[PDB]
Design a protein around this ligand. Structure first.
Ligand code: HEM
Length: 94
């Protein structure tokens, strides 16, 4: 623990508390808690999904490369290797 910051999908799916909004863009866990307002776009767009693959939205817009490398500066952790190494098809319902 407290090294690489490896978090599992379901674990990250429990990071949407009050003032704890995480997002796993691509295969990297970014903490945007202190970026909700700072984000030149807003908080709600950040707090829309949270704790999950927000790449869908992120890429829906694409973002500039400036923001891409910025993600790295906001990298807190990464998707658990057990999962990432063998991308398992996530469950869903509706
Ligand atoms: C790594 C995390 C993120 C960073 C560092 C980031 C950074 C930025 C930056 C710098 C811009 C300004 C435009 C540009 O220069 O490209 C921007 C705009 C924007 N971002 Fe993000 N962003 C992040 C995640 C997200 C996510 C996941 C969403 C959606 C769920 C989002 C939605 C938007 C929208 C909508 C705008 C433009 C506002 C508008 O025209 O409505 N961003 N972002």
């Amino acid at each position: 623990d407290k090294d690489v910051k490896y978090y599992t999908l379901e674990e990250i799916q429990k990071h949407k508390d009050s003032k704890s909004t995480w997002v796993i863009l691509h295969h990297k866990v970014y903490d945007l808690t202190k970026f909700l307002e700072e984000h030149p776009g807003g908080e709600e767009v950040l707090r829309e999904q949270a704790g999950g693959d927000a790449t869908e939205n992120f890429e829906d817009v694409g973002h500039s490369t400036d923001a891409r490398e910025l993600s790295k500066t906001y990298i807190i952790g990464e998707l658990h290797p057990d999962d990432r190494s063998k991308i398992a098809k996530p469950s869903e319902t509706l």
